[PDB]
């Protein structure tokens, strides 16, 4: 099984430079080319360029030539890519995809993509508000408002709740993330007993637990 | 340079054939563009299927094939499977660079349709004390995965301070998403009616709440 392992998330300030890696394995590293693609919500996929593990030769996208620098480390079977003078537009997911030869051919394996986020906003803790019904089954939830940077961990009753639970992804409004989670319980337990969401935030060493009361 | 276009979305059922096309603004797609198709299964899972107009990737199910249909490049999927529901991308080569299309959102109805389970939560008082309010409209159990959300204040469409997450695959393969409406705490004192309208496949579901 061929695999291309890439880091998941990278956080860096506008103006600095990063060196995204891409580990290969499962095949002869120097028999296939490596390409890099950039993906931002909106737009779609934009080709950055490639490098040939054997020759070292590379062909760049005119638009990214003064922006990226591809290279590879034969020993460790890994492909790298440094992006210079980082900005807001450079934020996104960056993939490394292996290329196949013969009569042109294809793009068969891909890395899971590293999501680069380029911003200079200090860590900001989330604010947890209990989402309660406007007083058969009942639905409850937690609002994790204005936290930064990604990502947070929400669980219900420590793990004391498999489903009814729903964790939506974060939305970016005013350079600040927000997300919520919902746990639908039988009309029985609540208010009778109670649910407690567990919010955590690594970039802030914060961990709020909020139990829900109807009012 | 050479914007490449594909269909927004397409809907097919298990067992039938669905075809995806790819437009080249420079004219026609030709054997020299080396058309490439790539699939995107949720959570950034990418896999190449076809390269060079018709070469099938190794380990790729037989039901996948590429070709040229007129002055376009196309990916045919005979006998669509449930897992085939994903996003498909078209890659075109132009002398020295690769240009993708916007991708096509393919739907294989591998289960029954289901209107969304909408829930409107009012701003909690703890937040209402920070001098700001937020309504939260949670949407779950709907299929296919696309919904269009609408907020209204006092029966009047409200546009600003509105945020809608992209629909996300649930555990039971259905879809879930959420929208948010952020007002100043003050601004929330003025109005009286608050409703979240969710439109799924031509059918609108509402959830109101009076302050």
């Amino acid at each position: 099984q061929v695999q291309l392992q890439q880091p998941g998330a990278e956080l860096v300030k506008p103006g600095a430079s990063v060196k995204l890696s891409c580990k290969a394995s499962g095949y002869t590293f120097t028999s296939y080319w490596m390409h890099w693609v950039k993906q931002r919500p909106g737009r779609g996929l934009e080709w950055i360029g490639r490098i040939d593990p054997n020759s070292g030769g590379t062909a760049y996208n005119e638009k990214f030539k003064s922006k990226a620098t591809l290279t590879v480390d034969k020993p460790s079977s890994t492909a790298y890519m440094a992006l210079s003078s980082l900005t807001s537009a450079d934020s996104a997911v960056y993939y490394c995809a292996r290329y196949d030869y013969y009569g042109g051919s294809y793009f068969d394996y891909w890395g899971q993509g590293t999501t680069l986020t380029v911003s200079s906003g200090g860590t900001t803790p989330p604010s947890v508000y209990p989402l309660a019904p406007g007083s058969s089954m009942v639905t409850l939830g937690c609002l994790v408002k204005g936290y930064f940077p990604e990502p947070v961990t929400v669980t219900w009753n420590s793990g004391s709740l498999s489903s009814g639970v729903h964790t939506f992804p974060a939305v970016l409004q005013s350079d600040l993330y927000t997300l919520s989670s919902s746990v639908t319980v039988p009309s029985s337990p609540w208010p009778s007993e109670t649910v407690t969401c567990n919010v955590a935030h690594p970039a802030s060493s914060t961990a709020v637990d909020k139990a829900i009361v109807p009012r | 340079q050479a914007v490449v276009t594909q269909e927004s979305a397409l809907t097919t059922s298990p067992g039938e054939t669905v075809t995806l096309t790819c437009r080249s603004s420079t004219g026609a797609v030709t054997t020299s563009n080396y058309a490439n198709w790539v699939q995107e299964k949720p959570d950034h899972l990418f896999t190449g299927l076809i390269g060079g107009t018709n070469n099938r990737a190794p380990g790729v199910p037989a039901r996948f094939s590429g070709s040229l249909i007129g002055d376009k490049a196309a990916l045919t999927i005979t006998g669509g499977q449930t897992e085939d529901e994903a996003i498909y991308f078209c890659a075109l080569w132009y002398s020295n660079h690769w240009v993708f299309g916007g991708g096509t959102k393919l739907t294989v109805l591998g289960q029954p349709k289901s209107s969304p389970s909408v829930t409107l939560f009012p701003p909690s008082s703890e937040e209402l004390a920070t001098n700001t309010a937020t309504l939260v409209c949670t949407i779950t159990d709907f299929y296919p995965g696309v919904v269009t959300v609408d907020w209204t204040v006092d029966g009047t469409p409200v546009t600003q301070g509105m945020e809608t997450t992209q629909p996300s695959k649930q555990s039971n393969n259905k879809y879930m998403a959420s929208s948010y409406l952020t007002l100043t705490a003050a601004a929330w004192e003025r109005h009286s009616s608050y409703s979240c309208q969710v439109t799924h496949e031509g059918h609108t579901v509402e959830k109101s709440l009076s302050r």
Partner: peptide
């Protein structure tokens, strides 16, 4: 098979 895609490096 047609000519373009290559041009090595």
């Amino acid at each position: 098979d047609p000519r373009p895609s290559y041009i090595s490096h």
